[PDB]
Amino acid sequence: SERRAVYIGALFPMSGGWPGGQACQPAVEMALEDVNSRRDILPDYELKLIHHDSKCDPGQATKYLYELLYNDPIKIILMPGCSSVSTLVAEAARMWNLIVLSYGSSSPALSNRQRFPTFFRTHPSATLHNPTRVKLFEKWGWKKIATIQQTTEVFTSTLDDLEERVKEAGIEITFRQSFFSDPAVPVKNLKRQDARIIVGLFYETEARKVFCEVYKERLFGKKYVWFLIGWYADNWFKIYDPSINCTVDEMTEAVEGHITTEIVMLNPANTRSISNMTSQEFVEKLTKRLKRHPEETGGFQEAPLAYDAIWALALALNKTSRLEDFNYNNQTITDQIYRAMNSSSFEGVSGHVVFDASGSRMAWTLIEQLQGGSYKKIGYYDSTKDDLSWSKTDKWIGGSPPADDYKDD
Amino acid sequence: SPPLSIMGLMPLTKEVAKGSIGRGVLPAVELAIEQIRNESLLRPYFLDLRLYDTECDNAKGLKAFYDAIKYGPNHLMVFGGVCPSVTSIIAESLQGWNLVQLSFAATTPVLADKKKYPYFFRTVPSDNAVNPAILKLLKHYQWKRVGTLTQDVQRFSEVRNDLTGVLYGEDIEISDTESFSNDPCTSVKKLKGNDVRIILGQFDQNMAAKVFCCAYEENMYGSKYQWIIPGWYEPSWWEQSRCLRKNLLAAMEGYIGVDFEPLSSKQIKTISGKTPQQYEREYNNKRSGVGPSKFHGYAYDGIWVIAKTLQRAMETLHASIQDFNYTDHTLGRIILNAMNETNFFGVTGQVVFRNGERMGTIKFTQFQDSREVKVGEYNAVADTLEIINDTIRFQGSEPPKDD
Ligand SMILES: *[C@@H]1O[C@H](CO[C@@H]2O[C@@H](C)[C@@H](O)[C@@H](O)[C@@H]2O)[C@@H](O[C@@H]2O[C@H](CO)[C@@H](O[C@H]3O[C@H](CO[C@H]4O[C@H](CO)[C@@H](O)[C@H](O)[C@@H]4O)[C@@H](O)[C@H](O[C@H]4O[C@H](CO)[C@@H](O)[C@H](O)[C@@H]4O)[C@@H]3O)[C@H](O)[C@H]2NC(C)=O)[C@H](O)[C@H]1NC(C)=O
Numbered sequence: 001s002e003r004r005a006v007y008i009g010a011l012f013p014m015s016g017g018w019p020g021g022q023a024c025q026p027a028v029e030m031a032l033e034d035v036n037s038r039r040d041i042l043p044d045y046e047l048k049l050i051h052h053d054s055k056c057d058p059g060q061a062t063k064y065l066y067e068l069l070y071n072d073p074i075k076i077i078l079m080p081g082c083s084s085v086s087t088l089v090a091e092a093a094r095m096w097n098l099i100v101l102s103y104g105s106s107s108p109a110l111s112n113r114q115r116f117p118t119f120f121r122t123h124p125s126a127t128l129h130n131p132t133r134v135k136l137f138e139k140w141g142w143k144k145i146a147t148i149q150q151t152t153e154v155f156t157s158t159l160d161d162l163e164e165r166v167k168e169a170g171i172e173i174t175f176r177q178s179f180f181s182d183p184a185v186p187v188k189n190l191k192r193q194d195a196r197i198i199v200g201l202f203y204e205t206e207a208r209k210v211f212c213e214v215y216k217e218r219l220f221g222k223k224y225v226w227f228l229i230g231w232y233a234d235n236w237f238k239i240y241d242p243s244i245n246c247t248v249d250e251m252t253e254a255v256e257g258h259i260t261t262e263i264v265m266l267n268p269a270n271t272r273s274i275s276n277m278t279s280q281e282f283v284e285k286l287t288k289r290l291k292r293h294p295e296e297t298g299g300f301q302e303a304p305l306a307y308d309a310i311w312a313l314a315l316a317l318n319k320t321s322r323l324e325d326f327n328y329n330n331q332t333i334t335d336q337i338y339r340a341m342n343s344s345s346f347e348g349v350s351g352h353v354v355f356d357a358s359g360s361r362m363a364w365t366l367i368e369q370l371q372g373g374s375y376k377k378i379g380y381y382d383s384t385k386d387d388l389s390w391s392k393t394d395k396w397i398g399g400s401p402p403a404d405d406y407k408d409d
Numbered sequence: 410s411p412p413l414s415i416m417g418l419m420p421l422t423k424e425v426a427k428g429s430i431g432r433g434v435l436p437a438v439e440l441a442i443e444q445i446r447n448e449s450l451l452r453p454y455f456l457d458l459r460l461y462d463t464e465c466d467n468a469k470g471l472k473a474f475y476d477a478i479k480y481g482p483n484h485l486m487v488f489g490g491v492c493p494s495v496t497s498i499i500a501e502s503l504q505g506w507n508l509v510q511l512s513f514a515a516t517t518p519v520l521a522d523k524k525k526y527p528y529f530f531r532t533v534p535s536d537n538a539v540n541p542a543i544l545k546l547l548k549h550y551q552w553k554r555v556g557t558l559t560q561d562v563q564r565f566s567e568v569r570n571d572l573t574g575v576l577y578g579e580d581i582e583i584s585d586t587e588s589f590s591n592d593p594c595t596s597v598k599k600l601k602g603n604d605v606r607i608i609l610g611q612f613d614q615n616m617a618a619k620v621f622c623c624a625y626e627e628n629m630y631g632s633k634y635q636w637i638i639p640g641w642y643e644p645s646w647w648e649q650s651r652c653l654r655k656n657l658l659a660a661m662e663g664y665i666g667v668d669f670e671p672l673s674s675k676q677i678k679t680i681s682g683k684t685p686q687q688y689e690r691e692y693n694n695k696r697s698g699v700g701p702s703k704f705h706g707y708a709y710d711g712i713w714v715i716a717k718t719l720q721r722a723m724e725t726l727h728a729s730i731q732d733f734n735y736t737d738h739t740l741g742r743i744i745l746n747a748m749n750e751t752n753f754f755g756v757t758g759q760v761v762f763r764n765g766e767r768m769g770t771i772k773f774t775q776f777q778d779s780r781e782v783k784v785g786e787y788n789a790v791a792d793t794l795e796i797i798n799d800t801i802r803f804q805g806s807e808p809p810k811d812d
């Protein structure tokens with residue numbers, strides 16, 4: 001008869017490297033209202049939020065993790081955003097028998113069950129680009145791939161995963177080059193080794209430097225296909241950078257025809273999910289709550305993952321249903337919510353939500369090609385069901401994709 | 410007699426491998442505490458050191474720290490932090506509780522970043538502290554061209570990365586940079602081919618025996634070669650596939666080892682009124698059955714750094730402690746300023762910091778027939794090198810040439 005409060009300890013990065021908390025906290029607030037107003041999910045329980053601003057800093061977050069664990073009320077789950085913050089709270093969590101659910105972590109390292117035994121994330125691992133890559137390689141008949149990365153743990157980890165995935169498909173990595181800040185020598189080597197199919201992993205500043213060097217070495221054209229992460233700003237190659245010699249027209253030339261993969265964060269379909277909202281309705285509902293415009297407010301594109309994280313937990317708690325008796329010294333309830341979280345399968349605002357053995361979210365990827373200085377949607381890929389939606393929107397200079405080999409030139 | 414509480418964070422369990430560092434330094438800690446209490450240096454107060462076992466684990470170590478803040482007394486500062494990943498977790502968060510930390514055994518260079526670890530200090534020189542010492546050695550023997558051999562493990566690549574910056578703007582060329590993960594033989598053959606004579610090696614004890622095995626096979630030893638490698642290996646480390654033992658010893662002959670100096674060689678009285686030799690006898694009697702630790706002097710000098718810092722802080726307050734709780738930003742800044750003033754002669758030599766980093770002494774050794782023998786010492790404060798006369802030796806008439 002008496003509805004009992006059950007608490008989530010969350011960390012929202014309002015500033016730092018990824019200020020995802022700016023749009024993710026209201027998305028969380030909306031999802032809790034939606035779960036609590038529905039009498040068919042947790043009728044006996046009321047889901048409440050206790051949060052702090054982590055500032056996307058592990059040191060800063062260590063202070064708030066203390067504040068969440070050593071102050072009443074007892075929290076039943078921990079919800080961090082940033083990969084660096086999730087690495088800290090997911091490793092520490094076993095000492096308080098706590099499930100950790102991240103709404104914003106993409107680091108491949110976070111999909112390690114030995115280090116992170118109770119960790120889940122609605123945000124997929126950066127390794128989700130790799131099955132789409134191996135599938136596009138298989139489609140266009142390429143078995144020889146060159147890789148170029150900026151020196152970052154996340155990129156190294158992503159390329160490490162790509163290796164074991166190409167080996168399964170009968171595809172090999174010809175050459176692997178890396179750079180900390182200057183990509184002049186790794187790109188010069190790509191031309192020297194006569195690389196044709198190239199996967200490049202870097203941030204936007206470095207991408208402009210890579211493609212300026214790519215123009216100078218004429219590392220673009222009919223012969224070459226570049227595979228990049230589709231996470232850059234709208235006309236990134238056109239953005240002014242005084243550190244690069246190349247012109248706007250020169251890099252619009254160098255980037256022509258390249259392929260990008262991007263994790264789908266909002267269902268492109270017009271269907272209704274468990275909240276009974278459409279992807280478009282969620283956006284409109286979210287836009288209303290915000291003080292500032294979506295363009296200004298950080299983590300806006302990731303906000304559907306935070307909304308869906310709340311539903312994943314609500315439904316997991318619904319499957320278990322003795323929540324008031326949770327204690328940090330007891331594994332019993334934790335093991336039950338872990339089992340319910342591991343068995344998650346529902347439709348959310350970001351699409352179908354399921355977790356792999358590592359606790360990492362499985363999702364669709366959006367495949368695009370740059371055609372005439374603009375990205376054009378060429379398809380979507382579903383890693384789990386192995387199904388590729390082909391648009392028939394792709395274009396190539398020789399009327400068909402080139403080849404990896406010296407053979408057809 | 411009010412307490413000045415200090416949070417002692419270290420692995421103390423016999424079960425944990427690094428618990429030997431924690432337990433091995435405790436007799437030295439006890440000695441410094443006992444004397445400071447007797448002399449009533451902190452009068453009216455007394456140093457209250459509370460020990461919490463971190464177990465050398467990220468989760469357990471964080472919980473130990475968290476439990477010390479929750480259930481423990483109001484600590485004024487942290488003492489300890491041995492294991493690199495646990496220490497980095499605590500050291501990064503320090504400002505959140507306005508706690509200054511002093512470590513005596515965490516040597517990882519990462520901690521020198523004062524943007525990330527502003528409240529962290531250490532009495533022990535870091536793994537990078539060997540590089541200004543090696544520069545001095547190269548200058549002394551007129552070695553202007555060097556090759557490098559590094560194991561692809563973070564502990565070693567950190568040192569190799571720091572070397573680049575130390576040799577920049579000096580008349581020293583790194584003619585060949587070679588890395589290896591499991592087998593050094595390919596890299597050792599490239600060094601031989603590039604005609605490298607002076608090799609700066611950064612690799613573990615297990616890899617060292619492989620390095621010297623490849624060195625014997627490629628004849629990269631004798632009168633023409635100088636290997637400058639880590640000096641922190643276990644004694645008789647080489648005794649512990651294809652080369653013979655006699656052939657390993659032949660290639661090893663004359664290598665120079667570089668590591669921090671455990672205790673001062675100067676027979677001068679320290680802040681306690683004892684010379685380093687007298688303290689060492691006092692430590693060896695007190696330790697009893699507990700095995701010795703090379704960080705014992707750094708732990709001892711550590712207690713003196715804390716007591717002297719607390720003195721300065723007490724004077725600063727009087728110039729204008731009980732109410733301090735982690736909330737007092739101002740006291741934390743006072744303690745932080747007082748620690749930066751540290752300048753006294755301790756059992757590990759002169760104890761002085763340069764941006765939280767110890768300016769200490771680096772020991773140079775040379776492998777001669779059956780063991781490593783001390784051949785010199787580098788003073789980081791003065792930036793000087795002293796080579797012990799009639800110890801260091803070369804197989805040829807002169808020290809080797811770099812080309
Ligand atoms: C999931 O999604 C939609 C949500 O609908 C909207 O979206 C939200 C974001 C908000 O903006 C809401 O305000 C908004 O409703 C739900 O679909 C609707 O839900 C009801 C369920 O029946 C429908 O309401 C009326 O339906 C019939 C007949 O409606 C006729 O009108 C439309 C055009 O106006 C036609 O296209 C229809 O084909 C149909 O001919 C009507 O009889 C009901 O009226 C009442 O009748 C009694 C008279 O004696 C009264 O006593 C009661 O009040 C009874 O309700 C409803 O008024 C509504 O049309 C659909 N709309 C759509 C778009 O399908 C959906 O139900 C929800 N699922 C849940 C909650 O589980």
Ligand SMILES: *[C@@H]1O[C@H](CO[C@@H]2O[C@@H](C)[C@@H](O)[C@@H](O)[C@@H]2O)[C@@H](O[C@@H]2O[C@H](CO)[C@@H](O[C@H]3O[C@H](CO)[C@@H](O)[C@H](O)[C@@H]3O)[C@H](O)[C@H]2NC(C)=O)[C@H](O)[C@H]1NC(C)=O
Pocket residue numbers: 746749750751752761762
């Ligand atoms: C943190 O410590 C720094 C070093 O302090 C010095 O060394 C200690 C071991 C101790 O002996 C202490 O008393 C020393 O001052 C501080 O930086 C130094 O501080 C001095 C500024 O007060 C500065 O000195 C000047 O002295 C005269 C001034 O005309 C000149 O002879 C000389 O050229 C100097 O300018 C000294 O240069 C500077 N040290 C370095 C290496 O930069 C630092 O301020 C201090 N911060 C605190 C206390 O908060």
Ligand SMILES: *[C@@H]1O[C@H](CO)[C@@H](O)[C@H](O)[C@H]1NC(C)=O
Pocket residue numbers: 040041318319
């Ligand atoms: C919540 O759990 C109950 C228990 O059987 C189930 O009937 C209900 O459908 C669940 N809610 C949702 C939205 O799946």
